[PDB]
């Protein structure tokens, strides 16, 4: 069903994210883990993004999406929802598009390319294709590991979810 197709697609993308393998003297590039995009970077068609989209009824979400085009005439992207049920190709300003990392940072070689404990991030919430505010609880220790995060969640008395796992592909700066 659609649920399964979606979750499978998310796994595929998380798992296929290449590990950055430098040699002595190299630094992790832009979009390796937590290293931000260069100033005035523009994502390429096919690249995955978090995209701030307003529904017809006004609800704003950061959704998982893919760049379709960028117009230098208007400085706007087109992006497509990675969910087939999202039938609208969205036009967005650069401020509504955050490139996802193109490399996984290896905690054993480039730990400065990971988010620090208690950093505020946007992270994809389990069983969804959307990003929400969270604090880093634990970084990955090994290249296969997920982040552990605490989502802001007003259904808890302290305002945070328990530790939930999110892959490096799906954690970006807030």
């Amino acid at each position: 069903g659609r649920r399964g197709v979606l979750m499978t697609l998310l796994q595929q993308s998380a798992m296929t994210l290449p590990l950055w393998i430098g040699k002595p003297g190299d630094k992790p590039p832009p979009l390796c883990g937590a290293i931000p995009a260069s100033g005035d970077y523009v994502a390429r068609p096919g690249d995955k993004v978090a995209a701030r989209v307003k529904a017809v009824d006004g609800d704003e979400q950061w959704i998982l999406a893919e760049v379709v085009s960028y117009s230098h005439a208007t400085n706007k992207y087109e992006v497509d929802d990675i969910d087939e049920e999202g039938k609208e190709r969205h036009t967005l300003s650069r401020r509504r598009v955050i490139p996802l990392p193109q490399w996984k940072a290896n905690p054993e070689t480039d730990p400065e390319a990971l988010f620090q404990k208690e950093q505020l991030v946007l992270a994809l919430y389990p069983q969804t294709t959307c990003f929400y505010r969270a604090l880093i609880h634990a970084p990955p220790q090994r290249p296969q590991d997920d982040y552990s995060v605490l989502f802001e969640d007003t259904s808890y008395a302290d305002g945070y979810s328990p530790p939930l796992n999110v892959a490096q592909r799906y954690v970006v700066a807030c």
């Binding site: 649920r3 979606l6 979400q61 998982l64 919430y125 389990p126 069983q127 969804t128 294709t129 959307c130």
Partner: peptide
């Protein structure tokens, strides 16, 4: 998209 509100 699949939202948290839908998910929960």
């Amino acid at each position: 998209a699949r939202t948290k509100q839908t998910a929960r």
